[PDB]
């Protein structure tokens, strides 16, 4: 799984070298950044439920047809709305995972791999999840480098959906 | 491969839960001790050539049969392979330290090593002893109190000692 | 040439990705460490001549036969002693190069590549240059993380000679 | 490849000199502005999909002939290749920014691109215009004053603008 | 471009053989089927405009939000509705191409290659084009093996969109 | 690989005999039913996306544990692999129908599949159920009486059902 | 084994596709041609013994030395003449095999593979078997497309012998 | 590669038009003459060995210098290569006939052949003459009136003659 | 691989000793008989085609079932493979003779041959008999007294017979 | 071209080594054997015409049909008999070439490469050339190691024809 | 590749003639001088390391600019490549001597060397001088009269000198 | 292991050929040279101890620091001097091995492979072993081609050390 520490180890191992000062600098920057990453992660985790309920509605606001139109892929049933909130919950949970592990590795492995294969098969519009992640970005209520951290991984998801 | 931070994420995901406060506070202590971790990696890596050579000298000094004609570091081809093995075993112990997890040591180095030496006809008992000698050399250098900001690093040395034992056990 | 910034770029480019927050952390640690690296580099550069004269003698002390024995590979002539000091000067100059560029890249490219090929052909004992680099390590007169930096690249040379 | 720090080392080595005080003080200013450099890379990279898409929309809106039957982004195979090219050109501009040197942009991306488009039959004039539109989009986002510690970043934007112009010139 | 005649030639050429009776049988079946393929192709070509206007509306019926919602990707402007009809026209034109050339080659080369790359970038829902192609399937007004032909290539498009 | 015509040749050759009148008349009946065979392949293949998707929906609707955190179609990487497997299993069932022989299904698809799922940790019971659901979907579509020259196709459906059962049995 | 149905399946499988209408056309041409192929096959099978006795003599006529010259490779003994008729019988049996399976696959697998290796080792002149197959071609007594079928596979053998 | 049907589609697409009535009626005449096309391919392919051999015999009978010591089919390695070339040239002429288009002959065979023979030192004049002799042999066999449903095939022979001339011109 | 001279060196090295006088005098006798060794290799190799063919004729003459329809040298593909195997087995027997050691026969040819024939379904009993027939043919030709300087070569023939038996035993 | 000197050079060059004493021994054995090889070569060259006329007849004796049967591949015309003698002359000329160059290289390059391709195309029986080479073997009238040399390369041809 | 014996065969074949008496007697003189040829190869090869090193020392002693910072054997990577080139050039000169023909020197070493150095920026004048110094060293060692059966070897040294000049000319 | 007989076998086997007269010549040259090789081998073996004691001293003469300087890599202890003589004994033993096996194979396998890896790790100067092998070369007391043989393999070692 992709992290600065695993990259540093992968970088050296590919070339059959012990680690050098080159790699050690990288991991320091990782430990140095953890401060702001741990802050963003714990803050989103605490206000997780409110963000998921907020984001889910922002989707239904922007795309009202998702609550009216008949079909399993839509949020026009108690099942659909349960599936929607679950999926939104997954995205947010992956964003905290990346902050804790200080890299894109978690979201890459558990979410992005085969993402376009699922959305295509199950008729899930990418833009629904952009609008979800857009709400989280604007309303997570973070400041300083904690906000820089959170948004970096949020936009990385958005880019994967576009 | 994983590290201390990627393993907790993996185990949390399998249950499908957000991290608890007792998991953030645990990982935050990991970061605070990060300075001690980097010195230990830097110090051991800075004396790689010596730790391998000195351990080899003592090994062959204790088991002369290894370098006798017929026996398993006679000829330069087998001697070099032995020096290489010791160097490789050390290389992946240092990888494990920086990450705080033995997954890379297990997956890449250890797994399928015992079975290799058996097919070759290499004493696994002799290999583990060479590992153990590198352990004592590596620990003493890493925890050498001269020329560094004083502070306790007892926990970190057990972890380092864990990876060295782990490799010895894997081929013993 | 190997640096944290080139590794970070190489890491992303190999996998056809834009840079992520994983790589950005690494470069911060590099810029954060530069403070101590620039200090060690400028300090050795200033006291360069004294270190080269000091190291050269430490070699002739430990190995007196290098000044007596006849042959072009030895420091028993004005030519030999000029070649010796030059070579020692090269090693020190490469150590400063690594501190400025924050990685092993310079010493790897300009010195280590084909090192064992030269020493073998021209009958130059590796231990001569260890003893040279050992003197620099003990007598550079640096403190704190500046000393940690300098020595990291000095020992990287020593390991390449052993 | 090189960066701002590796180029000065290379040019110093060719003369066989230690670094001067005017070279350390110059590189030390490089490190102090490092924070501004990382934000610019982070901001542009965080809006990669949009900068490519919006630039493409405007390009084909100005030159409809490109997407007409026969013409060089008609069919999804050629349209996708075009969107890919734009995405790749952008990818290597961001690489150059972080390093503070165009060597990676030159060696990997630009060199042997003009000659490619000529063999394919792709308007190099149209490519450069797509690059220029990404430039304006990238600069505005990077130097957007909302939500960041205020400070001058005029020099850095010219450097960023340099790499974008450089790619346009290379295929114009 | 993929056709039975090009496949037959590709099959032999890969194995360095002259054509055998194996390959000659295939091309006969192609010429034998052309009768129904040419009929379906000319019939759709004649009633092309009515089918494009009909299909375009069936989309706007099923998805009314595409004519209301603001944004370049939607048919809520004279530009958008022009782009919509054009795209639908393309799909139908490719279906006739496959009937004339007796294989999927045309639709594969001019349409399917990089299809998911376009829809993702320009925010075009696959289901819009399914509903378009669904209308053509039901209302082309063909019978016998002519209908079997037309629908075979129509469903091949639908499968590529799902 | 073989087909209905190549298998009879192979078995005839092993004895070293010319074909009997009861073998020509049997193979001639094969050709006469060829039209029905091509429709069944065409119809099933024309609804590939739906048969896979609808079968998957029902499967996960009956066994929610499969898509729960930890369990074997959680995450999009495993879900996609599952959708791929189902799609592949279907692809080789249609290959078998056109040929009138399961040799290609056996050699390429089935053989060494059960042993794969065991190493991965994938419920073979759940896979077979997904196959069975595709069977019912495939049969109903293939033998749908609307919009085709009426005629009996009972024998052909058992053969089609044979290949679907065969795959279920192979991993059950 | 090479047939239009196996080629059609091999064509699709190599590219990881389901079968398209391209491949389905090929197999129809195969089933359409079977009519004439089954006729040629059953006709040769019925008049098999007369053709083998006829062809064998045509060889001994054209090459009289094969019945006089001493040596195991010649038909100058009861063993040799038994081996000759057997071999001729094999060729004819393979020709019917290709008609039933509608392709060269049978003759390719059971006869042609390693053909030049046998004839070289056992000193069997290719021209003997051409003359055998030439007699079958002229005297099989078939008409229309049945004759076109039979001869196609007969000449494919002759070409393999030349 | 393309055929008679794929070329018209490609040229129609470049303009972005549906096929006209004068294009369907033209392609429908192509299908009606399809029977004559298959016989010509079948007949020529059925006498491949002879057309190559007989053409080679006459070639070397007219230009003995080719097989003299030093000259370009002396030794079996060069003679075999020559027989192979002739066989290959013929193989791709038959490919072109079945398709009704020379794209496969051009792309795979002809293009970059003249430049090959120049580097090798092979008379391109002698190659073209060998092609021409195969032409006359191929045409006579293809248009041989014995044992086939009588009918005019004059147009088809010019097309066949076109591909043979085309190869001669390409290396002449 | 080794030869008569490289094996004695290997066994001497394993003990770490110089060669004794009884080892030099033994190897010196090896060189003196070298002429007889080269004739035997030359003679057998000069009749390779015949020894293989004649042995095959007799084999299939004794076991007609092998070449009957179904049975393991029916069809030219299996017959050729059989003729190839016999030719290969012979090729490595001649390699062993020249060297005076079976290491190359063992390592390259024999080891993992029995297990091959079992998976294929090839009678190992029939293979060994084909080897034995080549033995008698090879020996008679090698020790044929006409047209060579007369002298005893009894020892050398047993050695040659040893390698042939060894191959028979390995697959019997 | 294959010779002991070219093999010795090829052996070293493949492994990037200078030549060792291993390779030098091989070339000595070559120069040592040249004595008998040069004797066999010059002896056959001198009695070349008599051997070609003798061998050609031995063929026509054993296979009388080659002088009677009509066809270009047979020696039943002044052209055919000229082609026959020429071909026999080629074989003998290659045998001398191998003796001079002390290896199979000449016969391999100028004769064996594509041999089975020619005989198959032009309907030339391998056994004709065996019988030719059999006569040369028996009637070259050489003794000692000169005869051992000549026959070694003659049988190498025979093996290539079988 | 060819040797002294394979070239005469090739030129004889191109005319299609048997060897004359003046060609056998010429090649027989080649064999008689074979002993002198083997000593020259043995002697030069036995002092490979020294001839390369001593020639390099003198070269850089005459052209210090080559090893100055910037210039083309500065740094160990370029110095090693230079020592390698010299070693390779020598390796192929010794190959040519043993064979008595420069075909292997031409085909493998020399051809496309001048064009390499031009692209790299390596003084071809300096390379040729390094070759010339190896020539004088190689000749003196080869024709050293101490410890060998006395006899004239003047012709052989010119041939050796020919190959050394040839390499110098090829890159001068 | 590399010998003329193993090379001859390797040469043929790589190209799937039986051995030709090309390879047989090589092995004759090997057996022809054995005479002088066996003489050099037995002569060095007999006078082995005197040569090892002589060579060891020539090292200590030329490099007196090896007997004074403290450290395990030096001959300044009873252990060191035992290790020295042992190593010298190994070199001589390998030289006899090459003469018996008529090639470099033994010294290549048992000594040269990984040679630079040992000397680098254990700080053993190559020049020490050159001086050892130089003494053996001058004082083995052989004449004629026996001396040519011995020295060929001695210089092959020296070249491997330089
Ligand atoms: C090109 C490789 C090569 C060959 C072929 C070769 C042959 C060869 N074998 C020889 C002799 C001989 N060859 C044989 C061998 C045999 N005599 C018998 O009665 C047995 C049937 C047969 C066993 C195969 C004998 C007994 C001698 C005489 C004794 C000796 O010189 O070793 C000689 C010495 C000259 C002579 O006495 O004729 C040579 C040159 N040398 C070579 O360099
Ligand atoms: Na052996």
Numbering used by the authors:
A (entry chain A), C (entry chain A), E (entry chain A), G (entry chain A), J (entry chain A), L (entry chain A): 1 to 162
B (entry chain B), D (entry chain B), F (entry chain B), H (entry chain B), I (entry chain B), K (entry chain B): 1 to 172
Question: Can you quote the paper on this entry?
Answer:
In this work, we report the first SSX experiments with viscous jets conducted at ALBA beamline BL13-XALOC. Small crystals (15–30 µm) of five soluble proteins (lysozyme, proteinase K, phycocyanin, insulin and α-spectrin-SH3 domain) were suspended in lipidic cubic phase (LCP) and delivered to the X-ray beam with a high-viscosity injector developed at Arizona State University. Complete data sets were collected from all proteins and their high-resolution structures determined. The high quality of the diffraction data collected from all five samples, and the lack of specific radiation damage in the structures obtained in this study, confirm that the current capabilities at the beamline enables atomic resolution determination of protein structures from microcrystals as small as 15 µm using viscous jets at room tem­per­ature.
In addition to the standard model system, i.e. proteins such as hen egg-white lysozyme and proteinase K from Tritirachium album limber, we included phycocyanin from Thermosynechococcus elongatus, human insulin and the SH3 domain of α-spectrin (α-spectrin-SH3) from Gallus gallus.
